[PDB]
Design a protein around this ligand. Structure first.
Ligand code: CLA
Ligand code: CLA
Ligand code: CLA
Ligand code: CLA
Ligand code: CLA
Ligand code: CLA
Ligand code: CLA
Ligand code: CLA
Ligand SMILES: CC(=O)O[C@H]1CC(C)(C)C(=C=C/C(C)=C/C=C/C(C)=C/C=C/C=C(C)/C=C/C=C(C)/C=C/[C@@]23O[C@]2(C)C[C@@H](O)CC3(C)C)[C@](C)(O)C1
Ligand SMILES: CC1=C(/C=C/C(C)=C/C=C/C(C)=C\C=C\C=C(C)\C=C\C=C(C)\C=C\C2=C(C)CCCC2(C)C)C(C)(C)CCC1
Ligand SMILES: CC1=C(C/C=C(\C)CCC[C@H](C)CCC[C@H](C)CCCC(C)C)C(=O)c2ccccc2C1=O
Lengths: 86, 194, 665, 70, 169
């Protein structure tokens, strides 16, 4: 699976969460920024690696980073449809 | 307000206050686009160079410096003249050009900051003879501009007459002259088609 | 109707049409997007009425452009051509309405065409077209040019007017029944009848006089006079080597009558199976659906034109004007391919913007079977060539697929003309000759089928999987032209219908290049050439009939077609006629190679290089406020594709034209 | 009758209640300022510059061919 | 072995073109080809006149190039790139004039950019100012040296983006 990390530069605009195609991310309460919320990545097992969160991130450099891990590819991260590894 | 020279066109508003503009004549709005100070400096320079040029163009056909092989067609005098002396002329012209403007030679540098208060064409040369009374001073400036413009047109005419006649200036029509029809001979689009 | 709203104020805005370009010129990507979306009237600011306005007015403006081009052609023929010399003696003088300047030694390009004329030999068949039309005078050509220019002005005025005449209530463009009926009865039926009238009344007497040898002004200013009872096409004009123009006029009269009859039966509702097409009628009332259908129709008609203009001779002396027939075939084949890939593109756009038809719901079997047929066709067809190569190299010709060895006879390729035995000749040239099909023709035709099927596979996959797929389920949300969906799910590069076209264009170009090479080599080897003396002639062909012996191997194609026949273009530098063709050969090679830059590289390298370069500009205080950017991914693909196709087409163009020009002169 | 169409190109359209004898100009309203702005657009500026440069080079080649002076 | 041999004129691989057999043969062949091409057309033809003009051009080219050096084997005129100004076909004159013109273009442009400092002006050119800068760029050598000396040309590297970060922050 890929690694989706969030950094404190986050401003809690929720655009990453809204752009998530498989609902990997969710906003959580925080005090670091004025919006009082920061995106989290609890369901990183479903991350496919499309980097749409990264596309939608406003900050100067991304407060959300998706690191691709081709060696640890799973069926959920590969979006397998015709074949099942479960 | 219609222009005096062209009563069917609007009067130019940015060229006022300069001698020789009695017939306000800027149909293309060059004074509007660019700075009239630079335009007038260039006009004076062209007038002076061109009147000196007409006098020299006439003189060279007859009289030349000792040595200095002649060229009846004064257009060829540049090639026929001593290259070192021609380079000396260029050197003197460059020295004068640099010194007169102190180094602010460009369209932006000149008439910028210091030197803007300087009159467009005033190089402080031979100003001891300028009449004190403003009426006579303006009349003299207008006379200079008129002679310069006439000299520009006259030099253009001299050069092109030499080109058409392929010969010296003074005989206006050489022996056997029949017309300038055959001078512009290089092929054109319409000419080649017809 | 209100023309006070057309002002030049918007001319300097440069991006008013697209709302996404409101933040003008923050980067060079803005310039590129402006150009890319200039003519995408659907996504531009306004309404559906405005979209229709723009579509129709742009069609009229392009009509005016084409009329201007035709008028320029007529003017060049009239004033800058040797049409007089060609008309009096077509064989000796090559057509040339093209003259070059003497700027930098460029006068070398002009070549001897006649005693008093020197220029560039044209290959468009315009001289033959004029001769068929009956145009034999500079005055006639001049008035044709004047008519074309007047038509250009009229079309320009029509576009400008219709930009405001049509309002939001305008609906005449949605009247499909009226549109089709008018086009079928007037534009096609009445048009064909009127052109038959023109032929009968003007071209037939003039052409008959020209065939006889009469050049009298009074005569220039009794149908079926010379045509025997022989079936049309079975007997060519002995003095011209083309179908009788009276037969052509009768053809046009019959075609116009048939079109009028079809229109009238449709008007009377005689056609009954409306329900079988009602689904398509409801679904495909869209700009892009109609554009795709029309593009495919015109592509197929262009291919049929390419085949017929050569196989069936109808223009005077075009049969013996070998460069003309070859260039016509190649040009129309290329247009067929381009318009077919265009039809695929706009089918994909229609699927994206509108609801698709129900054949998309079993798309997996369709594309799966197409994939299988493509694989099997390619394997068999190309592996026969590879087998021939390997076995011939090993030294076993008896094991190869050829007429002498194992032979694959095209049993289904059967005659239908029923022509008499022999060939038709005209002044030392073979105007018409039967093409004899064998193993080489079998193999090359199956190669053609393979390439066509692979191009169709790419286009159909792009069309059917445009809305969604197993990989990505929101391709509809992504749109039509996007680079990818991300590096995820393994990588979603070029999943868009735009990229499917970007690949189908490569495959169409490959198919058309093979088709061009097949036609060129087969015609040179087995059809074209001269003859040496009931009389029997031994026919000396330009390529010496080597297609049937050498075309069975890829090495034979490489040697006897490319290397052997590139002698003219490769050795064209000293020759005044074709030095330009040699230089264009070289430059097209350069451009094709230069395209690989964009086809192989990626955006990020160039963006980083641009930033490193911009460091120095910033250091020296050269700050471009339209910040430089690397070309987008889709733009890089488009640029690479354009340069690739242009370079390949230029190489083929120069090679074939140089060969033909040298051989015929 | 005046109607708002909600079209930027033709905000309003007028219909006649009967036969009318009125001026309806079909010519567009073009201003010299608008034309000057359009030509000031970087494209026209640089295209004119490049066309003049190319013409100058071509004319130099015409007038002094083969660089005999060099 | 001598300072005199430093000049490209005193080289064993080159010869004056007027004395080069290969150069003479090449030109003779070009003239023969042009005349043969001319002979095809009629005497009083416009193409005949054009071919006469081309033949004259070739002869004048031969006369002009006779002075230039060219290799013995091929006899094609060569371009001297040692730096000798007083030599035929010297590269210095074209080099100097091109360098002046290119610096003119660069200076003009940089000056427009500095004066405008706006993407809107970059897109819609301020034609008056652009022409003013183009005209002003003639003194670019002196102006550029003065700005370099006085520090108005280059800005410290700490004022511009250095690039990507190569270490931990
Ligand atoms: C801008 C005006 C102008 C320019 C460009 C030239 C340029 C030239 N003049 Mg000069 N000349 C000028 C004004 C000018 N003249 C005037 C006003 C006079 C009248 C006194 C002369 C009288 C004059 C003479 C008598 C001779 C020249 C000659 C020359 C040539 C070489 C010597 C030199 O420049 O000094 C050179 C082409 C020489 C010549 O004939 O060169 C071929 C020469 O002998 N000029
Ligand atoms: C044709 C020969 C020529 C001659 C004799 C001169 C003479 C002069 N120039 Mg130069 N100048 C020339 C060509 C020439 N210029 C050209 C072609 C240009 C345009 C590129 C300039 C642009 C120019 C500028 C911008 C300036 C000078 C200045 C000077 C002075 C020289 C300072 C110097 O060298 O200090 C020793 C080193 C002197 C008045 C300076 C001046 O007059 O300052 C008061 C000055 O600022 N010149
Ligand atoms: C700065 C560049 C430059 C220069 C110095 C010249 C100089 C010349 N050109 Mg011109 N020319 C230029 C650019 C230039 N041209 C360009 C860009 C074109 C392409 C249209 C032409 C096309 C052209 C033709 C076809 C002819 C000339 C001719 C001439 C000569 C007479 C002046 C004329 O007709 O100008 C014309 C200048 C133009 C820019 C053309 C205007 C184009 C449209 C209509 C916009 C206005 C003269 C030697 C004529 C001549 O005397 O031939 C013997 C001639 O036949 N030129
Ligand atoms: C499809 C359209 C088309 C095309 C491709 C050409 C192409 C050509 N024409 Mg043109 N021509 C056309 C339509 C066309 N024409 C029409 C409609 C007419 C009038 C009905 C003419 C009338 C015409 C004449 C009278 C002549 C040409 C010539 C030429 C050639 C040189 C053009 C030149 O020097 O431009 C120069 C460059 C420019 C004008 C610059 C264009 C852009 C700036 C902004 C203006 C060139 C092959 C010339 C030729 O063949 O000479 C041997 C020639 O004499 N043409
Ligand atoms: C593809 C070609 C084409 C088509 C389909 C149409 C279609 C139309 N034109 Mg026409 N038109 C064309 C070319 C075309 N035009 C051209 C080239 C011009 C320039 C001369 C015009 C100039 C023009 C005008 C000035 C008008 C039309 C009008 C019309 C309408 C037809 C009514 C009419 O008078 O019919 C009989 C034929 C309709 C929107 C009229 C309209 O819309 O009235 C409401 C109208 O006023 N057209
Ligand atoms: C009276 C006869 C007549 C004629 C000669 C034409 C001719 C034409 N119509 Mg048609 N049209 C007609 C009646 C007619 N129309 C009528 C009565 C209507 C209903 C109002 C229309 C409505 C109509 C529309 C809405 C459109 C046309 C278009 C066209 C052009 C399409 C050509 C094309 O795509 O070729 C294809 C050839 C190749 C690809 C090669 C052509 C010039 C199209 C166009 O672009 O017009 C400018 C178009 O969009 N017509
Ligand atoms: C008056 C009757 C008539 C005449 C004289 C012609 C004549 C012609 N047609 Mg035909 N044609 C006609 C009616 C006619 N057509 C009709 C009613 C249609 C239906 C709309 C067509 C559709 C048609 C097409 C689609 C084509 C032709 C073509 C041709 C040309 C070559 C045909 C050939 O060699 O056939 C050989 C003759 C035979 C095989 C004998 C069979 C005759 C009948 C079936 C019995 C020739 C000019 C071709 C063309 O233009 O090529 C450039 C072409 O592609 N025609
Ligand atoms: C690394 C290669 C190199 C470099 C940097 C130079 C540099 C120079 N050479 Mg060149 N030169 C070279 C190789 C090189 N040369 C070689 C290989 C040869 C042997 C053929 C020569 C032979 C040669 C000669 C014979 C002359 C030069 C001259 C020059 C000067 C040209 C600029 C000038 O005029 O400045 C000074 C400003 C004026 C400069 C010192 C010329 C020179 O100094 O002219 C004054 C000169 O006369 N060079
Ligand atoms: C202390 C200090 O600083 O010194 C002082 C000294 C001093 C003297 C006091 C000063 C001054 C003033 C000077 C030097 C003024 C000079 C003025 C001149 C030379 C004017 C020439 C005009 C020529 C014309 C109109 C030609 C016209 C020609 C025409 C119309 C020609 C026309 C034809 O050629 C054409 C065009 C074709 C020919 O075929 C036919 C003809 C007719 C010949 C200063 C400035 O204070 C400086
Ligand atoms: C002599 C000679 C030679 C040699 C040469 C050389 C070796 C040279 C060198 C050179 C060099 C080694 C140089 C250096 C440089 C450096 C630097 C550091 C620079 C910089 C620059 C700049 C900064 C610029 C700026 C500007 C201007 C001025 C103008 C335009 C714009 C701009 C902004 C770009 C040869 C043999 C070749 C040839 C013959 C002669
Ligand atoms: C080279 C390259 C670039 C860099 C190329 C750029 C930025 C193009 C430069 C555009 C110029 C400024 C347009 C002007 C036209 C040419 C300079 C014209 C030259 C004409 C000659 C005859 C002189 C990309 O950005 C890129 C992006 C994605 C895939 C592949 C590539 C790619 O291959």
């Amino acid at each position: 699976s890929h690694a989706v990390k969030i950094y404190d530069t986050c401003i809690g605009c929720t655009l990453c969460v809204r752009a998530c195609p498989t609902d990997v991310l969710e906003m959580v309460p925080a005090t670091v920024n004025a919006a009082k919320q920061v995106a989290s990545s609890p369901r990183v097992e479903d991350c496919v690696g499309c980097k749409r969160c990264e596309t939608a991130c406003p900050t100067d450099f991304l407060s959300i980073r998706v690191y691709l891990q081709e060696n640890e590819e799973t069926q959920y991260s590969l979006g397998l449809d015709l074949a099942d590894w479960s | 307000s219609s222009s005096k020279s062209l009563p069917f066109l609007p009067k130019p508003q940015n060229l006022g206050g300069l001698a020789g503009g009695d017939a306000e004549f800027d149909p293309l709005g060059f004074s509007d686009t660019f700075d009239v100070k630079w335009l007038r400096e260039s006009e004076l320079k062209h007038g002076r160079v061109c009147m000196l040029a007409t006098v020299g163009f006439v003189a060279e056909q007859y009289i030349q410096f000792p040595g200095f092989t002649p060229a009846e067609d004064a257009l060829q005098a540049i090639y026929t003249a001593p290259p070192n002396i021609t380079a000396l002329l260029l050197f003197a012209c460059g020295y004068i050009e640099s010194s007169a403007y102190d180094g602010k030679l460009t369209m932006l540098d000149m008439f910028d900051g210091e030197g803007a208060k300087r009159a467009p064409g005033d190089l402080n040369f031979g100003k001891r003879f300028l009449p004190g009374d403003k009426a006579a001073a303006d009349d003299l400036a207008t006379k200079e501009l008129s002679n310069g413009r006439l000299a520009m047109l006259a030099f253009a005419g001299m050069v092109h007459h030499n080109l058409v006649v392929k010969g010296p200036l003074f005989p206006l029509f050489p022996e056997g002259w029949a017309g300038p029809q055959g001078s512009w001979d290089l092929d054109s689009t319409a000419g080649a088609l017809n | 109707a209100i023309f006070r709203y057309v002002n030049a104020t918007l001319w300097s805005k440069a991006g008013h049409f697209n709302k996404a370009l409101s933040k003008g010129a923050k980067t060079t990507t803005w310039i590129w997007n402006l150009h890319a979306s200039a003519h995408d009237f659907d996504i531009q600011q306004g309404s559906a009425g405005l979209i229709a306005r723009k579509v129709f007015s742009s069609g009229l403006a392009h009509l005016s452009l084409v009329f201007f081009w035709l008028g320029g052609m007529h003017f060049h023929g009239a004033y800058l051509s040797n049409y007089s010399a060609w008309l009096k003696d077509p064989k000796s003088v090559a057509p040339s309405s093209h003259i070059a300047y003497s700027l930098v030694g460029q006068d070398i390009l002009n070549s001897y065409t006649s005693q008093y004329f020197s220029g560039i030999t044209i290959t468009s068949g315009f001289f033959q077209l004029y001769r068929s039309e009956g145009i034999v005078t500079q005055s006639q050509l001049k008035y044709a040019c004047a008519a074309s220019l007047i038509a250009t002005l009229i079309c320009l005025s029509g576009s400008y007017l219709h930009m405001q005449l049509m309002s939001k209530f305008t609906s005449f463009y949605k009247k499909f029944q009226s549109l089709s009926q008018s086009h079928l009865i007037i534009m096609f039926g009445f048009g064909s009848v009127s052109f038959s009238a023109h032929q009968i009344h003007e071209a037939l007497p003039i052409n008959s006089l020209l065939d006889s040898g009469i050049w009298d002004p009074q005569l220039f200013s009794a149908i079926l006079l010379g045509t025997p009872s022989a079936i049309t096409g079975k007997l060519l004009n002995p003095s011209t080597g083309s179908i009788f123009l009276s037969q052509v006029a009768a053809h046009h009269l019959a075609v116009g009558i048939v079109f009028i009859t079809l229109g009238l039966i449709k008007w009377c509702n005689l056609f009954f199976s409306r329900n079988a097409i009602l689904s398509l009628r409801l679904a495909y009332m869209d700009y892009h659906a109609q554009l795709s259908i029309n593009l495919a129709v015109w592509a197929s008609l262009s291919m049929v034109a390419a085949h017929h203009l050569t196989e069936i001779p109808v223009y005077p002396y075009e049969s013996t004007d070998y460069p003309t027939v070859l260039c016509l075939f190649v040009h129309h084949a290329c247009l067929s391919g381009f318009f077919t890939v265009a039809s695929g593109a706009h089918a994909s756009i229609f699927v994206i913007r509108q609801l698709p038809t129900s054949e998309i719901r079993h798309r997996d079997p369709i594309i799966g079977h197409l994939i299988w047929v493509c694989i099997a066709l390619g394997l068999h067809s190309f592996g026969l060539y590879c087998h021939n190569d390997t076995l011939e190299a090993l030294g076993r010709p008896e094991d190869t697929f050829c007429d002498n060895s194992i032979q694959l006879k095209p049993i289904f390729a059967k005659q239908f003309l029923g022509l008499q035995p022999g060939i038709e000749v005209l002044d030392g040239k073979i105007v018409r000759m039967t093409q004899e099909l064998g193993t080489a023709d079998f193999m090359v035709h199956h190669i053609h089928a393979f390439t066509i099927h692979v191009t169709l596979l790419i286009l159909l996959k792009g069309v059917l999987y445009a809305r969604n797929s197993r990989l990505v389920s929101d391709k509809l949300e992504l749109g039509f032209a996007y680079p990818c969906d991300g590096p995820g799910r393994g990588g979603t590069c070029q999943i868009s219908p735009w990229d499917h076209l970007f690949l189908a264009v490569f495959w169409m170009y490959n198919c058309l290049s093979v088709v061009i090479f097949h036609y060129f080599w087969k015609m040179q080897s087995d059809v074209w050439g001269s003859y040496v003396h009931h009389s029997s002639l031994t026919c000396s062909h330009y390529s010496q009939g080597d297609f049937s012996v050498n075309s069975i191997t890829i090495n034979g194609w490489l040697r006897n077609l490319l290397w052997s026949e590139a002698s003219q273009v490769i050795q064209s530098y000293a020759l005044p006629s074709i030095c330009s063709y040699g230089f264009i050969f070289l430059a097209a090679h350069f451009v094709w190679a230069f395209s690989l830059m964009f086809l192989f590289s990626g955006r990020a390298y160039w963006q980083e290089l641009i930033e490193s370069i911009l460091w120095s500009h910033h250091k020296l205080k050269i700050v471009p406020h339209i910040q430089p950017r690397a070309l987008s991914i889709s733009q890089g693909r488009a640029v690479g594709l354009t340069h690739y196709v242009l370079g390949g087409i230029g190489c083929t163009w120069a090679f074939i034209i140089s060969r033909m020009l040298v051989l015929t002169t | 009758i005046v109607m708002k169409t909600n079209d930027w190109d033709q905000p309003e359209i007028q219909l006649s209640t009967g036969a009318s004898n009125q001026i309806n100009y079909i010519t567009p309203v073009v201003a010299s300022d608008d034309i000057k702005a359009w030509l000031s657009l970087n494209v026209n500026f640089f295209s004119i510059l490049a066309l003049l440069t190319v013409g100058g080079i071509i004319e130099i080649q015409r007038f002094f061919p083969d660089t005999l002076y060099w | 072995n001598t300072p005199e041999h430093w000049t490209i004129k005193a080289s064993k691989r080159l010869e004056l073109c007027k004395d080069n057999k290969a150069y003479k043969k090449k030109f003779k062949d070009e003239l023969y080809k042009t005349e043969k091409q001319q002979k095809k057309y009629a005497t009083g033809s416009a193409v005949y006149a054009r071919f006469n003009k081309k033949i004259a051009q070739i002869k004048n080219r031969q006369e002009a190039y006779g002075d230039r050096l060219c290799g013995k084997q091929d006899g094609n005129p060569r371009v001297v790139a040692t730096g000798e100004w007083n030599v035929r076909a010297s590269v210095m004159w074209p080099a100097s004039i091109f360098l002046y013109t290119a610096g003119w273009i660069g200076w003009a442009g940089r000056s427009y950019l500095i004066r405008t400092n706006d993407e809107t002006k970059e897109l819609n050119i301020d034609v008056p100012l652009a022409l003013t800068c183009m005209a002003s760029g003639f003194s670019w050598p002196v102006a550029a040296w003065q700005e370099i000396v006085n520090g108005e040309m280059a800005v410290p590297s700490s004022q511009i983006h250095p690039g990507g970060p190569y270490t931990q922050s």
